Symmetry: C5
Subunit: 366 residues, 5 copies
C-alpha cells in the first residue's frame, strides 16, 4: 500500500494538491497508457478531419460530431461509478479486516499455555506456527505476491512454516479442496492435547483459545470467499461499458470543428481537448480506483503488503510466546502511587496549545 | 459463480476491457435476447417511417419522435438503478455469508468430542452429519440446484446425509413448517448425550459446541428469511417500469428522422442507433445485475455453487473429525528455535521487489 | 409478504417484466386510486382548456403551462426518494431481524434443561411458553394483525400463551409501561429455579440460557423501539411534499396545448399524458415502496406475516423441547465409514451440468 | 418523539398526504419562520422592482435576475443534502441505540443475585439503582431535558438515584472528568461483594453480570462520544452554505420580471413564487431534518423522550428485581399438553383473511 | 474536536446559520487561503481582459470563456465528493471508535483482581498502566500531537507510563516492527500471574479479563491499520482533480465578458464572481471536509483530542482500580423500598411540559 497519512494530517492550503505530485500508487501511473491512446486516437481523428477528408466528407463527419456530443451523458456514468466503486471499496476494506493476524491468538497463547520448560515452549510456538501456517496457506491462494514467495508447499517447508513431518500428514489428506483449514484443525488437536496435560490450566482458558481460533479461521475462510466470490462480472462489465461508451462519445463529440461553418459551441481550435482530458482523468481514474482495489492482493502499488504482514505476524507471535512468556518486570510502584490523581506531563510543544477546559457534556454550560 | 479474480489482480492497460470478452456470466449472455428485440423493434419502426407511412403520417410520427426524446430522462433511471442494485448486492453478499458452513463446528467437534474408539468416532461424524443435514435441508428449500439434486427426502437418505432411522423420526414429526432446524435439535441432543458420558470433557467445551451450533442454525434461518422475505415487489416493479419507460421513450425518441425537414438534432442517418444500443447495454445491463443477484441460488452462471459448498463441507468436516482427530506430528523444534527472531526466506521473484523499510507509524519520520 | 423468489431464480428474457403482471403486493394495487385521481384531474384541466375557457383565458393558462414545466425538476425528487426509501428499507429489514424467534432459545433449552419426567417436561415447555409469551405481547403492541388476533390479554390466556395464574401476576404488576419484558423476567426466575434443582446441570448451561434470553429480549425491545421511534416525521413530509410538488407541476406543465399558437415542445395532442403516467408510476410508486414498508407490521400484502411467525415459533419450540427431547436414533455408521473421503451422489438433472474443476484459489493457475 | 407508526400501518390512498396535516414535529413548525422571512424578502424585492426602481434601474435588476437564475443549481444541493442527512440520521439512530437501558441488566440481576431476605433484596435494588444512576449522570450530560430535571447532583440525591453516603464518595473522587462511569465501578464492587457471600451462586453468573454491565457502560460511553464528537462543523457549514446560496439565488433569480420587455421564461405575474415556495419546503425542510436530529437530546418535538426512558427503566428494573424476584406461578400444564402440535385460535377478524398455505421454501412448487 | 452539540440542541430559526459565525474548526479557517488565491487569480484574468489584451486578443479570450463554461459540470463533481467524503467520514468515525479506552478493562480489573494490600493494589495499577502504555505507544505512532508529547520512549518513562525496568525489557525485544502490542502481552503475563496466586479468584474472571484485553488490543491494532492503510491514493487524486478541473473551468468560464459584443448569459458586470465564490465555498469546502478528516489524528481543530483521552483514561482507570476498589457505601434502603412503583420527581422546568400519556404500542389506540 501507498501510505500518505502523515502528508494529510493537518488540512493545509495546498494539501490535496501536493498529492497530485505523487507517482507511486497514483492516477498517473494507472492512467497514462490509457490517456496517451485516448489522446492519440483523438489527434488521429482531428488530423483526418483537417488534412485527409474531402469537403463533403467533412460535413458528414461534422454531423457525426454533433450527434455524439448529445449522447455524452457525463451525469449517469457517475452513479454507476459511485455505487460500484463504493461496493469495491467496501469489499476492499473488509478483505483487509479478514487478513490472518495472529495477535489475538498470541495473547491467549502466552496467557493460557504454560511452562518455561522446552515442552511448554514448544507448545506455544507450534500453536503460533500453526496459526501462521493457515495464514500462509490462505494468502498463497489469494495473493500473487505470497504465491511467488511460496510457489510450492516445499517452499513453505523450507521457510519453516511447516515441518517435514507435518508435510507428510498435509499431503496424505485425501481432499480435492484447498487445505488452508488443516493447521486450524491441528491447532484444536494441539490445544486439546495441552489441556489434557494441564499446560492449559483451566477449561475457560481452553475455551478462549478455541473461540480465538475460530475467529482466526473464519477470517481465513472470508479471504477465500472474497477470492472466490468476485464482484459480479455483469456489474463490472456494465460500469466498463458505461465509461467507455462515454469516452467513445467524447473522442468524436468533442472534436474541434472548423469555425467557418459557424457551428455553435464549436467556434474554437485548441488542438488539445484539455477539458476532455481532465474528464478522462476524472472518469477513467474513478474506474481505476475499482480496477486497483477489486483484487487488493495483487502487485499494484496500493495493494496490500501481504508478505510484510506474514513476516510481521510470524516474528511478533514467536517473540510474544517464547521470549516474552512470563518475564514481567517485578511489580513496582508507579510515579502516581503517592498521588490521588494521575496526570502525565507535557512537552513545551504540546503544553502551550492544549490545557483547555475539560468537556463534561453539552448541557452543563446551560 | 464466475470467478475472474486472477484476471484483475494487477490493474493493467486493457484490464477491465478484456473482461468484455468473457461470455460466461456476462452482460452479453444476459442481454442479447433483449437487445435483439429492442433493436428489432427499432428497425421495424424505422422501416415503417421509411417505406410504409404516407407523407402526412410521417409528419405526425416526427412530432411523436420529438415528444418522446423530451421524456428520455436517463438521469433519474440511474438513481433508482443505483439504490436498488446496491440493495440487491447487499442482500446477495449477506446471503453468501449465511451459507451453512460447518468449518467452525468441525473445529469445536474435533477439539471437544473425544475418543479414538468407534463410539467417539461415531459421535464426531454424527454431529457433523447433522450439521450437514441441516445445510442440505435448508439449501434444497432455497436453491433450485440443490433441489434438483435432492428432489425428495429419500434422495437425502440415499445420499447418506440422513439415515433410515433418522428418516422415520423426521417424517413422524407433526409440523406443517419446514423442518431444516430438526437436525440442529438432534445436534443438541447428541452433544448433551456426549457430555453425560464424558466424551465432552468439560462444560465450557459443551457450551462452545452449543454457541457454535446456534451460529450455524441462525445462518440456516437467515437463508430461509431471505428466501421468504424478497426484495419488496413494489420496489422491483418501480425499477422495472423506470427502465422500460426509458427504453419505450428511446425506440421512438431516438428514431432517425428525415433530414429534409431540417429537424434539429436530427440531421443524420445511421440506420443503427449505436449510442442508444450502448445506453441499452448500460441501463438494461444494470438492471440485469439485479435480475441475476435477486435470487443468488438459481442456475445463473454468477449464482452460488451451492452443490459445491455442500460437497466441500461434507467431505472436509468428515475429514477433519475422523482421520484428523488427534494425529499431530510429534512436537518438534522449528527452523527458528536457535533464532531470537523469525523471518522466512524469499524466492528470487519476490526478494528483489520487496525488502523495503518497515512501516512503524506515520508520525515517526517527523 | 409477497414472495416471488422462485420466479426470479434464473435471470430470464422476460423475467422482471412478468413481475409487472402480478397484482398482490404490486404497484398497481398501491397506485391505481392515485393514478385515477391524477389522470382524472389531468383530463379535467384538459377539458377546461378545450371547451370551457375563453380565448384570452386560454392564453393565460398557456403561460401557466410553460411556467410549471420549468419547475418539473424530476432529477432532485429522485435523491430524496433514493435516500429516504433506502432508510425505510434499512429499517424494514432490521425490523424483520428483530422478530421474536424462539429457535436459538429452543436449542439451548432442549440441550440444557433436563428430565424425561413430567417436571422437566414442564420446565422445558414453560421456558418456551414464556419466550413465546413475550413474543405475542410485543407483537400485539406493534402489529395490527396480531392485535386483532389478541385484542385483550384474556385472548392471550384463552390462546394458551398465558395461564390464569400467570394472568393474575401479570395484571397485579404496578407498571404504567408495556409489560412485554415480564415473561423474560419469568424466564430468568424459572431458569434459576431449574439450576437450583439440577435440571440445568452446569453453570455454563445456565449462563448460555441467559445469554440466549437477553438476545431474545433485546430483539423484543428493538421492535418496541422501531414502533416508538418512527422515521422522523419532517423527513417523511419532505419526501411527500417533493413528490406532490413535482406532480402538481406535471398536471399543468404537461398539458397538451393547442398547436395553432406554435408553442415549442407543445406541437402534439395525445389526450392521455402517457409518459407523465409512466413518470407517475415511477415516482409515486417509489414513494409507495416507503409507504408500504415504513410500518411493516400492518396488513399490507408485503407486510410481515407476524401471525404466521407466532404460530410457527410456538408449534416448533413445543415440538423441539417436548417430543424431540432426548430421542436420537441410535448412533449408527453412515454411508462413508469405510470411505476415506465423503461425496454424495448427483441426480441426472445435476450430474451433467456440474462436476467441474474445484476452485482452489486465484493464484494457482499461475 | 412524534410517533405516527399507527397512521402509516397500511399504505392507504391519502396516506402520506394526511401526515402533511400534522403540526407537532412537522416541517411547518420547523420552517414557518424561515418561510415567512424568505417570502417577505421576496415580496420586498418584488415591490422594489414595481414601485421604487426607476426604468433604467429596472433593466439592471432584470439583468441581475437572469444572472442568478443561471446559478440556481437545485441538483447539487440535493447530494450534499442527501449524503449529509443520511450521516445525521445514522448518528441519530445509533444515539438512540446507545441509550442506557437497564433491561438486559435486570434479567441477569434477578436471575443471578439471590435471596428473599432484606439483604439480597437490597443487593438487587442497589445494582439496578447504580445502573440507573449511570444512566441519569450520562443523560444529564447530553440531554437538556434531563439536565433541567437534574440541574445539580443534589437533585439526583433527592430523586433517590443517589444516596447521601454515595454522594460523599461521589464528590470526594478527585477527577476533573465527567463521573458517569463511577456507579459502573460501584456495580463491579457490589457484584464482587455479592459473589464473595454467595448471593451470586456461581462464577459464570458473576461473569455474565460483568459482561452485561460493560455492554451497559459502553453504551453510556457512546452517548458521551456522540455528544463530544459532533458531526464535523465544516460539513455542517458546507451544507448550510449550499442551501442558503441556492435560496439567495432564488429570491433574485425567480423574481417575476415585467413581461413588456419580453424576457423569455419570464412572461408571467403570479406575485407569489409558489413553486419556489415549494422548493423552499423541499430543500430547507430537508436541512431541517438534520437540524432537528443532529442533537437528538434537546427539546425538539421529534427529539428523544429521555426523561420518559429514565422513568421507565427505573420503575421497571425496580419492579423486575424486587417484587418479581422468584415468584413464578406454579409449574402447571398448558393448553397443549395432550396435543402433539400447538396452534393458538384466531378471532373472527383474523381467521377469515389468514389461514393460507405455509411457505416451505421457493424451490418446492417446482 | 470542535463541539457545537449544545448550539444545535433545538432546531431554531437561525440555527445552522449561526454556525456560519464560528471560526474554530470552520470552513473559513480551512478555505480562506484557497479562496483568496482563487479570487486573486480571477481578478488577474479579469484585469488582463480589461486593460492588457488588445481587441483581437479579447475576442479569442471570449471564445475561451464560452468554451470553459460548457465544461463546468458542477453535477458530477458532487457524486465523487459525496461518495468519497462519506468514505472518509466512515473511516473517521471508526477511527474514533478504535481509540484505546481503558474503561471496559478498568471495570473488569476492579471486579476481578483482588486485595486491599499493597500487592493487589500494585496488581490493579500495573494492569491499568500496561493498558495505558499500549494506548500511548499506538497513539504516538498515529497521532502527531501525542508524538510531540512523547517524542522518545524516554519521554514515556518520565511520564510514568513505563518504568525503567520495563524500558529495558522493551528495548531488548528484537523486533523491527512497532511494539505497541508488547504491554498487551505483559498484561496477559500479569493476569496469569495474578490467577496463579488467587488474586483473580476464578477462571471465568480471568477469561473475562483476557476477552476484555483482546478487545482493547484489537482496537490498538485497528488504529495501526487505519494509519497504515490510507484512503487509496488514486481515489484521493481523482476527487482532487475533479474539484480543481471544475475550478479551472470556473475562473475562465465565469469571467464577466464585455456586454457590447452581446454574448448571451454574459450581459453583466459584477467585478466579483459572487456565486462562483459561493460555489467555491461549497465544492472546495466539501473537499476540505475530507482533507480535515482523512487523518483525524493531526492538529486540525476538528481532529481528535488524543492527549486529552490519554490523560482521561490514565487518571480515571487509576482512580477506578486504586481508591474505588471495594469501598461501597453500606447497603442501605432507597427512597422506594416502601413503594411498589418507583418514579423520580420533576423540577418545575420539566413537570409542566412532560407528564403525557405513556406509549404502549401503535396498535393499542385501535
Ligand atoms: Ca489490485
Ligand atoms: Ca439468479
Ligand atoms: Ca405497511
Ligand atoms: Ca434536536
Ligand atoms: Ca486532520
Ligand atoms: Cl463465555
Amino acid at each position: 500500500t501507498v501510505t500518505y497519512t502523515a502528508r494529510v494530517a493537518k488540512a493545509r492550503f495546498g494539501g490535496f494538491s501536493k498529492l497530485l505530485l505523487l507517482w507511486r500508487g497514483s492516477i498517473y501511473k494507472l492512467l497514462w497508457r490509457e490517456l496517451l491512446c485516448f489522446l492519440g486516437l483523438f489527434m488521429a481523428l482531428s488530423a483526418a478531419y483537417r488534412f485527409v477528408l474531402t469537403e463533403e466528407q467533412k460535413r458528414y463527419f461534422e454531423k457525426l460530431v454533433l450527434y455524439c456530443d448529445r449522447y455524452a451523458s457525463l451525469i449517469p456514468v457517475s452513479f454507476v461509478l459511485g455505487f460500484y466503486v463504493t461496493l469495491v471499496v467496501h469489499r476492499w476494506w473488509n478483505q483487509y479486516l479478514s487478513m490472518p493476524l495472529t495477535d489475538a491468538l498470541m495473547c491467549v497463547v502466552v496467557g493460557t499455555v504454560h511452562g518455561h520448560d522446552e515442552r511448554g515452549r514448544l507448545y506455544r510456538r507450534t500453536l503460533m506456527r500453526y496459526a501462521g501456517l493457515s495464514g500462509v496457506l490462505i494468502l498463497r491462494s489469494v495473493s500473487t505476491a505470497v504465491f511467488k514467495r511460496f510457489p510450492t508447499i516445499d517452499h513453505v517447508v523450507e521457510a519453516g512454516f511447516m515441518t517435514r513431518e507435518e508435510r507428510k500428514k498435509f499431503e496424505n489428506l485425501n481432499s480435492s479442496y484447498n487445505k488452508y483449514w488443516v493447521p486450524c484443525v491441528w491447532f484444536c488437536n494441539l490445544a486439546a492435547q495441552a489441556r489434557r496435560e494441564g499446560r492449559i490450566r483451566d477449561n475457560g482458558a481452553f475455551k478462549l483459545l478455541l473461540e480465538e481460533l475460530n475467529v482466526f479461521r473464519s477470517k481465513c475462510g472470508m479471504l477465500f470467499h472474497y477470492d472466490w466470490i468476485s464482484v459480479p462480472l455483469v456489474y463490472t462489465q456494465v460500469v466498463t461499458i458505461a465509461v467507455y461508451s462515454y469516452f467513445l462519445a467524447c473522442l468524436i463529440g468533442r472534436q474541434f470543428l472548423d469555425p467557418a461553418q459557424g457551428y455553435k459551441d464549436h467556434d474554437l481550435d485548441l488542438c488539445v481537448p484539455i477539458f476532455t482530458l481532465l474528464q478522462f482523468f476524472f472518469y477513467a481514474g474513478w474506474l481505476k480506483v475499482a480496477e486497483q482495489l477489486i483484487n487488493p492482493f495483487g502487485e499494484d502499488d496500493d495493494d496490500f503488503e501481504t508478505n510484510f504482514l506474514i513476516d510481521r505476524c510470524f516474528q511478533v507471535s514467536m517473540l510474544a510466546v517464547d521470549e516474552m512468556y512470563d518475564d514481567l518486570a517485578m511489580l513496582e510502584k508507579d510515579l502516581y502511587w503517592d498521588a490521588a490523581e494521575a496526570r502525565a506531563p507535557y512537552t513545551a510543544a504540546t503544553a502551550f496549545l492544549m490545557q483547555q477546559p475539560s468537556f463534561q457534556g453539552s448541557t452543563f454550560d446551560i
